[PDB]
Amino acid sequence: QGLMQFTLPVRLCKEIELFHFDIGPFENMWPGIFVYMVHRSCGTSCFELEKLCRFIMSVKKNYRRVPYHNWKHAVTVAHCMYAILQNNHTLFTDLERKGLLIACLCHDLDHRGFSNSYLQKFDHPLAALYSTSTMEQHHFSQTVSILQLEGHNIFSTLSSSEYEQVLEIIRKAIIATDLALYFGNRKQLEEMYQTGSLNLNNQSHRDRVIGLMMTACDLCSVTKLWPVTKLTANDIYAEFWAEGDEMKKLGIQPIPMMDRDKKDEVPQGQLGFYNAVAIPCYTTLTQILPPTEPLLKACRDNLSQWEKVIRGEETA
Ligand SMILES: Cn1ncc(C(=O)NC2CC2)c1C(=O)Nc1ccn2cc(-c3ccccc3)nc2c1
Numbered sequence: 589q590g591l592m593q594f595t596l597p598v599r600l601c602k603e604i605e606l607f608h609f610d611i612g613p614f615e616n617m618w619p620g621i622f623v624y625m626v627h628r629s630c631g632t633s634c635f636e637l638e639k640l641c642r643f644i645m646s647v648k649k650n651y652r653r654v655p656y657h658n659w660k661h662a663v664t665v666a667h668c669m670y671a672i673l674q675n676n677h678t679l680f681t682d683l684e685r686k687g688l689l690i691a692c693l694c695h696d697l698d699h700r701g702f703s704n705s706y707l708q709k710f711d712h713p714l715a716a717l718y719s720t721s722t723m724e725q726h727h728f729s730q731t732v733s734i735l736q737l738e739g740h741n742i743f744s745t746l747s748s749s750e751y752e753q754v755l756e757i758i759r760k761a762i763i764a765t766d767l768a769l770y771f772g773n774r775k776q777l778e779e780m781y782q783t784g785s786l787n788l789n790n791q792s793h794r795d796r797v798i799g800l801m802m803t804a805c806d807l808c809s810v811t812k813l814w815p816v817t818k819l820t821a822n823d824i825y826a827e828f829w830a831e832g833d834e835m836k837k838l839g840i841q842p843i844p845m846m847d848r849d850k851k852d853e854v855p856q857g858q859l860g861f862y863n864a865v866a867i868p869c870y871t872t873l874t875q876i877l878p879p880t881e882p883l884l885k886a887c888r889d890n891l892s893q894w895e896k897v898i899r900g901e902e903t904a
């Protein structure tokens with residue numbers, strides 16, 4: 589008798605299936621939205637509800653009150669993964685469904701709103717511990733610490749070898765969110781797709797596809813309706829500009845996107861980001877996973893919005 593099913597109001601029940609769904613401003617509804625997505629994408633028996641709830645609330649507590657890399661971003665990235673999984677349900681394993689929504693929820697644990705570059709320039713202790721993907725190795729380590737709390741082992745029914753596999757899916761998925769690694773990963777996938785060598789039975793290939801899925805989920809603000817896209821950009825720059833201030837305090841000239849004095853160049857910066865990162869990301873994903881097309885369509889629609897801003901037909 590596991591007859592306690594999670595339900596959502598009618599609008600949320602329908603719209604959560606859309607790639608461009610926004611999870612809304614009611615923080616207290618996000619745990620329920622996450623459980624609902626786990627129950628539908630994994631199954632009601634994937635996790636003990638009590639342990640999963642305790643886990644969710646400890647993850648929330650270890651996100652910080654920062655403008656962008658916060659609890660809302662964690663659930664937002666998990667929702668984009670939910671939509672990819674639900675529209676490609678025959679392509680993933682039992683352990684991949686169990687691991688990937690958890691990886692998305694945890695992927696920015698204990699973020700302070702600073703890049704790997706800032707931690708290196710600051711000489712933060714984390715940069716000595718983890719020389720590459722500094723924050724991402726920290727996010728994984730935070731994930732392990734939480735899974736090891738009493739009553740928090742959500743994978744308790746897995747064998748030692750299966751637990752190890754799911755922790756390895758999570759580790760690689762979280763590390764893949766280091767955008768420095770995305771450029772190389774997408775190039776390899778594009779090469780593998782265009783030569784017809786890409787093989788979803790090859791684990792090292794599955795790792796690359798999951799990595800690109802993680803990038804796609806992580807950047808998914810560019811795949812929302814324009815008003816969501818535009819408002820989320822404010823939170824992104826709130827963080828970039830705070831880091832730029834901190835770079836200036838260290839006596840280092842920040843890169844342009846982190847300099848608040850360069851505010852008027854944001855529309856052109858966005859255009860650069862969409863052309864160099866977002867459009868290629870969703871293009872390669874759509875080639876590998878054709879049902880993810882709505883992400884690419886929404887990204888192209890937002891690219892056209894930023895062009896309208898640059899021409900002075902829209903105001904930001
Ligand atoms: C929308 N989105 N979602 C995720 C990221 C992202 O990268 N997040 C980091 C990974 C955590 C962005 C993003 O907005 N990224 C960028 C990227 C490059 N830029 C350059 C300029 C620019 C500004 C003024 C002047 C000149 C340039 N602005 C940008 C913004």
Ligand SMILES: [Mg+2]
Nearest residue numbers: 695696765766
């Ligand atoms: Mg991150």
Ligand SMILES: [Zn+2]
Nearest residue numbers: 695696765806
């Ligand atoms: Zn993120």
